Paper text:
BMPR2 encodes for the bone morphogenetic protein (BMP) type II receptor kinase (BMPR2), which assembles with type I BMP receptor kinases to transduce BMP ligand signaling through the phosphorylation of transcription factors SMAD1/5/8. Mutations in the gene BMPR2 have emerged as the predominant risk factor accounting for some 53–86% of heritable cases and 14–35% of idiopathic cases. The type II receptor BMPR2 lacks the regulatory GS domain found in BMP type I receptors and is accepted to be constitutively active. BMPR2 shows the typical bilobal architecture of a protein kinase.
Author numbering: 197 to 364, 374 to 510
């Protein structure tokens, strides 16, 4: 199909700050449909354009189908982005509902990291040149879970190409996931490309924390705590940029590792180190996504505890 006459909208399945998301049907096939109002036009153009970059199809990037303007029956402008429908919803929602064993949690962490490494990596392939991309608002709500328990990265409304022909306020993402240099207005734009990959990597660390806070094998003989976002106990819901700057940049705080994680094991010690190397104060000392994928691959495969 790929033509918005054949498009039927069913129930709402989510919303963020730019779009409302509905389950739908495009010529008999289940799909998900992200609806932008006129005010959010630029975010639509950005997201569509990032999805249409050559070689953006990947197991760990959300599957885009078609995007275009559709005027309402009332003569208002809307933008519709049609993509594959993921019944598990966002990683945040999945983690709310589910705990997972070691292999499953590593699968979630490894698949998200693989997506981000793919996104971050420039593919200079002539007619199919893929630029390096930064997500710019990486978090649990912008990651979706497939039916196989692997993740895809979604929501490229704020993403930016970092290499290639046509380029470039940093204070634009979700506040709780902002790196300290973002909260300081200190992002070092001399090396645009590295600085912005490093900003995603910090957020990746927070994502890791949320995933493993829900791993059954990290809380042996005990209850796994109910799901909470990174920093939720410290700052609550909807922190201000100011309050976050104090906690994260000034006080250098990070989500705490439970006492239940006794690091007399290689698996746990390397888990903690990998998370800590992602959300490091020194942007330049943070793991790359490729290094992080290898860390997570190795943890997934660790034989015995
Ligand atoms: N393809 C999809 N399948 C299932 N749920 C989705 C899909 N895309 C988005 N969602 C849900 O809708 C929410 C908002 O989508 P998102 O694209 O992040 O919009 P925004 O840019 O406004 O935050 C997500 O957090 C997720 O819960
Ligand atoms: Mg979003």
């Amino acid at each position: 199909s790929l033509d918005l006459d054949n498009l039927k909208l069913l129930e709402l399945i989510g919303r963020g700050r730019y779009g409302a998301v509905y389950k739908g049907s495009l010529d008999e096939r289940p799909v998900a449909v992200k609806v932008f109002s006129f005010a959010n036009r630029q975010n639509f153009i950005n997201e569509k354009n990032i999805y249409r970059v050559p070689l953006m199809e990947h197991d760990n990037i959300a599957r885009f189908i078609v995007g275009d303007e559709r005027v309402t029956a009332d003569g208002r402008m809307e933008y519709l982005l049609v993509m594959e429908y993921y019944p598990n919803g966002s990683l945040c929602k999945y983690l709310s509902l589910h705990t997972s064993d070691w292999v499953s949690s590593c699968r979630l962490a490894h698949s998200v990291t693989r997506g981000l490494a793919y996104l971050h990596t420039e593919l200079p392939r002539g007619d199919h040149y893929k630029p390096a991309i930064s997500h710019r608002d990486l978090n649990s709500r912008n990651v979706l879970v497939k039916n196989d328990g692997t993740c895809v990265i979604s929501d490229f409304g704020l993403s930016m190409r970092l290499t290639g022909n046509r380029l470039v306020i940093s204070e634009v993402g979700t506040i709780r996931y902002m790196a300290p240099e973002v909260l300081e207005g200190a992002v070092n734009l001399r090396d645009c490309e590295s600085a912005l990959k490093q900003v995603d990597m910090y957020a990746l660390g927070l994502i890791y924390w949320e995933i493993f806070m829900r791993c059954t094998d990290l809380f042996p003989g005990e209850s796994v705590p109910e799901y909470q976002m990174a920093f939720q106990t410290e700052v609550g819901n909807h922190p201000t940029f100011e309050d976050m700057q104090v906690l994260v940049s000034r006080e250098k705080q990070r989500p705490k590792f439970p006492e239940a994680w006794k690091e007399n094991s290689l698996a746990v010690r390397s888990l903690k180190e990998t998370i800590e190397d992602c959300w490091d104060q020194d942007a330049e000392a943070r793991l790359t996504a490729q290094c992080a994928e290898e860390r997570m691959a190795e943890l997934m495969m660790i034989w015995e505890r």
